[PDB]
Ligand binder design. Structure first.
Ligand SMILES: *[C@@H]1O[C@H](CO[C@@H]2O[C@@H](C)[C@@H](O)[C@@H](O)[C@@H]2O)[C@@H](O[C@@H]2O[C@H](CO)[C@@H](O)[C@H](O)[C@H]2NC(C)=O)[C@H](O)[C@H]1NC(C)=O
Ligand SMILES: *[C@@H]1O[C@H](CO[C@@H]2O[C@@H](C)[C@@H](O)[C@@H](O)[C@@H]2O)[C@@H](O[C@@H]2O[C@H](CO)[C@@H](O)[C@H](O)[C@H]2NC(C)=O)[C@H](O)[C@H]1NC(C)=O
Ligand SMILES: *[C@@H]1O[C@H](CO)[C@@H](O[C@@H]2O[C@H](CO)[C@@H](O)[C@H](O)[C@H]2NC(C)=O)[C@H](O)[C@H]1NC(C)=O
Ligand SMILES: *[C@@H]1O[C@H](CO)[C@@H](O[C@@H]2O[C@H](CO)[C@@H](O)[C@H](O)[C@H]2NC(C)=O)[C@H](O)[C@H]1NC(C)=O
Ligand SMILES: *[C@@H]1O[C@H](CO)[C@@H](O[C@@H]2O[C@H](CO)[C@@H](O)[C@H](O)[C@H]2NC(C)=O)[C@H](O)[C@H]1NC(C)=O
Ligand SMILES: *[C@@H]1O[C@H](CO)[C@@H](O[C@@H]2O[C@H](CO)[C@@H](O)[C@H](O)[C@H]2NC(C)=O)[C@H](O)[C@H]1NC(C)=O
Ligand SMILES: *[C@@H]1O[C@H](CO)[C@@H](O[C@@H]2O[C@H](CO)[C@@H](O)[C@H](O)[C@H]2NC(C)=O)[C@H](O)[C@H]1NC(C)=O
Ligand SMILES: *[C@@H]1O[C@H](CO[C@@H]2O[C@@H](C)[C@@H](O)[C@@H](O)[C@@H]2O)[C@@H](O)[C@H](O)[C@H]1NC(C)=O
Ligand SMILES: *[C@@H]1O[C@H](CO[C@@H]2O[C@@H](C)[C@@H](O)[C@@H](O)[C@@H]2O)[C@@H](O)[C@H](O)[C@H]1NC(C)=O
Ligand SMILES: *[C@@H]1O[C@H](CO)[C@@H](O)[C@H](O)[C@H]1NC(C)=O
Ligand SMILES: *[C@@H]1O[C@H](CO)[C@@H](O)[C@H](O)[C@H]1NC(C)=O
Ligand SMILES: *[C@@H]1O[C@H](CO)[C@@H](O)[C@H](O)[C@H]1NC(C)=O
Ligand SMILES: *[C@@H]1O[C@H](CO)[C@@H](O)[C@H](O)[C@H]1NC(C)=O
Ligand SMILES: *[C@@H]1O[C@H](CO)[C@@H](O)[C@H](O)[C@H]1NC(C)=O
Ligand SMILES: *[C@@H]1O[C@H](CO)[C@@H](O)[C@H](O)[C@H]1NC(C)=O
Lengths: 550, 38, 50, 148, 49
């Protein structure tokens, strides 16, 4: 249904002070606001394309797209990842009457284009659409500017439309784009392409958004009237520091807005074998609660994802860490306590609880760092004539202390006269048996419990998470992750010889100063990215825009 | 510095770093934002 | 004194800012970061007043 | 919300940016509703900051989320005699989702080294699996309906 | 627009929803009153400024 239709390297220009949008949906009137967000930097490189030459271009964090035209050549866009009917794609078209927006699964042609010849023709965009989760309809003299973003499942489009007369270039000036649409499409986007309406000339400029700090000025009508890019030159930085658009004569010690970290490196030790989650998780027979089992875990890649298709945990509670940050940490020492209790007593496995299990059988400290996992096991621990193989302790003279065990079987004396064996009137045997039948209510069915307790300290890592390492970048401002220790700064070689076991060394200010590379045991040291001794000599910004730097 | 004998006696009694040297306690406070102007 | 005052955790779990950002996620970290910020502004204000 | 007292009994009703006693005094500007069906033990993963199988590959919530999550048991409507094999879920993905993202692709997940190109053999898996809801299941894997 | 704030980030004007008419909000408190008194021991009379 579609056909296939010498190229030259595209030229470049600068978006002088264009491409400012509204960062958020709040309403502000008559104020100066300092924001940090994804913006188009001033005097930044835009690619000037055009002859048709429709390429597929990257979509990094957002896109500023500008077009100058006289006869409505530019029609719409397509956004996606593969654009090949194996994933979902977004299509925005304007067929001279309406605005069509479709999130579907298109099989796009290699060179899409609409058709004009003089009613209409040649709708040679795609071949077939299948699933179509989202549908939306609405039934040189011009400069059209757009900013596209997508975050948290929303695709946001901002736009502006101004009349121009200068012909063959993107004019210098200032533009603030008003919000246009906000569609809840919820797809992944990495590439995009534009649709041209053939006749059988116009240009577009493409630039990309980057994280920056801006100073914005809000009108009475909450229309952004001025903006300052605070990483451009020293005058912009001193305007940003004072939060003003004018400066008088002075010296003006300034702050740091000029350097942004770019790369992120990860360094983990060379551990390959996975953890035995499956020999401590199915493990035909578990242990009684009063004689619980403790086991050490070492030399592991602790992957929790190999348990998704086997067990369904009713309870997963971590205390000193966050469950979303277990894939980035290396631990030094890890234990595992396992036992079996009744369904209603799983609430007592927590720091600070009381009852029967937490008083006489198993107790947790107040300052506990670890996770507790529980799951129902009626299919493995319950039998027809009951399963009288798990015991528990009911009578004790005094409460336990954290991580203490008591396997004694004396005769508890509840009355006055001594017992000396011979469990009579006020003498009891202190251990009783759980009876697990397969017809029990959920309150007293068997549950298997595993408690993991790990520590992080200045020592080699034994068990670590499933994160892939990468290359080392030196003499640059990077984020780094060494053995689960994160930071920002510049990595350079040094000579501060460590102890055999030492992993990192701090300084007097209790900030990390040197670190040891895990794979190649070589010391490095960390210095700040910021230079904090720069001053800007300026006359009045009214008289002139020249500065000197000290 | 064309100063007299008495001033030379006075300057010795009272006991008062390039960025190439920091790369003690002065460099520890230079990295945390504290600067001393001349 | 202004530099020695950076070893204090003003009720936070730790005084190091990279051991809070490497073990907790933002909603659970903003409660400790907002204690360190408040405690580290007071030292600057005391220094300026003196 | 008072026209639902005599019909449904919610096992879970959790509001995050507001208070449940102040929903009768507020006017909202925009309201959405996401609905789906999961297993009884995976209702704890519908929360900001959780991890597991549902929150990693199927449905994820932002950290700064303002709204409510409601769940209720529906063994009487979703379970049948010969099972109810009409609800699926995703088990293998190359990377974790982002908040409020959807992934309906059905490629062949490559877990080993050699390319799969279809032909799900030794280390190639089809990534979607079916829930089987029988009316004799334990409460841990009975169907639950969730609305956010 | 439904409401408008002021420089102190406090609500200053609001729009009536049923009859689309603007209103504005002023504080209930007058904060410039001073009480001239002799000793409460001598007498219980005051003047107000
Ligand atoms: C940790 O591993 C690196 C890289 O390991 C190499 O690749 C692995 C897949 C496996 O084949 C290892 O046996 C390899 O050594 C080691 O760095 C290498 O060190 C050797 C010298 O022994 C050197 O010849 C290689 O070029 C290095 N490779 C790289 C990429 O740097 C490193 O020695 C291991 N760390 C330890 C525990 O010493
Ligand atoms: C919002 O409603 C008020 C009151 O609504 C009236 O009573 C309702 C039960 C119903 O019968 C409505 O159709 C009535 O209008 C509206 O205020 C009225 O405005 C009309 C003029 O259109 C006036 O003649 C009435 O006296 C007003 N009544 C009162 C009590 O003020 C109001 O206009 C509606 N707001 C909107 C959306 O415009
Ligand atoms: C950024 O681009 C603008 C626009 O092309 C450049 O402006 C040109 O400047 C030269 C010398 O000042 C003039 O001769 C041209 O007429 C200008 N062109 C237009 C259309 O205005 C500007 O020089 C570029 N450089 C920067 C970094 O500002
Ligand atoms: C451009 O927009 C759409 C693209 O499909 C079309 O307009 C509608 O198309 C559907 C399907 O053909 C019809 O059922 C509607 O009656 C059309 N009208 C509306 C609501 O716009 C059509 O191809 C183009 N629009 C027109 C009217 O020419
Ligand atoms: C989108 O629709 C396509 C149509 O091919 C779906 O693929 C399945 O195709 C088979 C026949 O080859 C049908 O029996 C299935 O019913 C289709 N599945 C569904 C659920 O529609 C494709 O899976 C659909 N996408 C989704 C996941 O909704
Ligand atoms: C640890 O052991 C001691 C000795 O068995 C227990 O202490 C005794 O407690 C009884 C009452 O339970 C007192 O009559 C004895 O006088 C105590 N002896 C001493 C030396 O204090 C103690 O209870 C045990 N601790 C725990 C954790 O239960
Ligand atoms: C969004 O889509 C991109 C492209 O499909 C995915 O990014 C790729 O991830 C694979 C590994 O999973 C890498 O080998 C590719 O190099 C990545 N490509 C790019 C351009 O980064 C990305 O994973 C998807 N994002 C989400 C949310 O999962
Ligand atoms: C998942 O494991 C299967 C066998 O496990 C059984 O079926 C699954 C769906 C769960 O109900 C589990 O509790 C049962 O024990 C394998 O046949 C299947 O291929 C596995 N999936 C993988 C690894 O692709
Ligand atoms: C309540 O609804 C009744 C029908 O609902 C059924 O009975 C109630 C008590 C619940 O068990 C519900 O789950 C059942 O589906 C009506 O007959 C009854 O009149 C209703 N009450 C009212 C509206 O007065
Ligand atoms: C257009 O080029 C693509 C590139 O591979 C090709 O697959 C397709 O068959 C071509 N279409 C026509 C009509 O030649
Ligand atoms: C824009 O890119 C071109 C070619 O890549 C380069 O010559 C030019 O210096 C760049 N402009 C800026 C401001 O870096
Ligand atoms: C707000 O917009 C109106 C036009 O509707 C204009 O008259 C007014 O001057 C604007 N307010 C400003 C510029 O402060
Ligand atoms: C228990 O786990 C081991 C380790 O993978 C496995 O070989 C064994 O088959 C498992 N047993 C059951 C009954 O799942
Ligand atoms: C700014 O310069 C203008 C033009 O020379 C002059 O008229 C004005 O007085 C100056 N204002 C200030 C504040 O220096
Ligand atoms: C209060 O008045 C009484 C009676 O005139 C007088 O005796 C006394 O000194 C007064 N005390 C003060 C505090 O003015």
């Amino acid at each position: 249904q579609c056909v296939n239709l010498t190229q030259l390297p595209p030229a470049y220009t600068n978006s002088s002070t264009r491409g400012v949008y509204y960062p958020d949906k709040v309403f502000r009137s008559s104020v100066l606001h300092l924001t940090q967000d994804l913006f188009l930097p001033f005097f930044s490189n835009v690619t000037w394309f055009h002859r048709f030459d429709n390429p597929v271009l990257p979509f990094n964090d957002g896109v500023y797209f500008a077009s100058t035209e006289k006869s409505n050549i530019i029609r719409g866009w397509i956004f996606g990842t593969t654009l090949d009917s194996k994933t979902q794609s977004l299509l925005i078209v304007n067929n001279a009457t309406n605005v069509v927006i479709k999130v579907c699964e298109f099989q796009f042609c290699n060179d899409p284009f609409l058709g004009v010849y003089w009613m209409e023709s040649e709708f040679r965009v795609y071949s077939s659409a299948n699933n179509c989760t989202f549908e939306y309809v609405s039934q040189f003299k011009n400069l059209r500017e757009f900013v596209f973003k997508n975050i948290d499942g929303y695709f946001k489009i901002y736009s502006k439309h101004t009349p121009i007369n200068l012909v063959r270039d993107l004019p210098p000036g200032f533009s603030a784009l008003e919000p246009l649409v906000d569609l809840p499409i919820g797809i992944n986007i990495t590439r995009f392409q534009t649709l041209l309406a053939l006749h059988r000339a116009a240009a577009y400029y493409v630039g990309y958004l980057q994280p920056r700090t801006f100073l914005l000025k809000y009108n009475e009508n909450g229309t952004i009237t001025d903006a300052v890019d605070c990483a451009l030159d020293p005058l912009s930085e001193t305007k940003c520091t004072l939060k003003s658009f004018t400066v008088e004569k002075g010296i003006y010690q300034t702050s740091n807005f000029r350097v942004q970290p770019t790369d992120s490196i990860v360094r983990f030790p060379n551990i390959t074998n996975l953890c035995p989650f499956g020999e401590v998780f199915n493990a035909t027979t578990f242990a009684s609660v009063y004689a619980w089992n403790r086991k050490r875990i070492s030399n592991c890649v602790a992957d929790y994802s190999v348990l998704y298709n086997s067990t369904s945990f009713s309870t997963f509670k971590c205390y000193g860490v966050s469950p979303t940050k277990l894939n980035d940490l290396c631990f030094t020492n890890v234990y595992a306590d396992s036992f079996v209790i009744t369904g209603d007593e799983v609430r007592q496995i927590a720091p600070g609880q009381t009852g029967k299990i937490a008083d006489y059988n198993y107790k947790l400290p107040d300052d506990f760092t670890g996770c507790v996992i529980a799951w129902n096991s009626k299919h493995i621990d319950a039998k027809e004539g009951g399963n009288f193989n798990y015991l528990y302790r009911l009578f004790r003279k005094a409460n336990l202390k954290p991580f203490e065990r008591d396997i004694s079987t004396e005769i508890y004396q509840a009355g006055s006269k001594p017992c000396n064996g011979q469990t009579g009137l006020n003498c009891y045997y202190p251990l009783y048996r759980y009876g697990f039948y397969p017809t029990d209510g959920v309150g007293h069915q068997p549950y298997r419990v595993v408690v993991l307790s790990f520590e992080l300290l200045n020592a080699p890592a034994t068990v670590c998470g499933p994160k892939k390492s990468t290359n080392l970048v030196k003499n640059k401002c990077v984020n780094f992750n060494f053995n689960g220790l994160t930071g920002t700064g510049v990595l350079t070689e040094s000579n501060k010889k460590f102890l055999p076991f030492q992993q990192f060394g701090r300084d007097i200010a209790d900030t990390t100063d040197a670190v040891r590379d895990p794979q190649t045991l070589e010391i490095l040291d960390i210095t700040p990215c910021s230079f904090g001794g720069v001053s800007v000599i300026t006359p009045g910004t009214n008289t002139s825009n020249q500065v000197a730097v000290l | 510095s064309k100063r007299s004998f008495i001033e030379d006696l006075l300057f010795n009694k009272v006991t008062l770093k390039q960025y190439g040297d920091c790369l003690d306690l002065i460099c520890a406070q230079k990295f945390n934002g504290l600067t001393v102007l001349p | 004194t202004l530099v020695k005052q950076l070893s204090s955790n003003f009720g936070a779990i730790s005084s190091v800012l990279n051991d809070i950002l490497s073990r907790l996620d933002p909603p659970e970290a903003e409660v400790q970061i907002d204690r360190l910020i408040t405690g580290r502004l007071q030292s600057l204000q005391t220094y300026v007043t003196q």
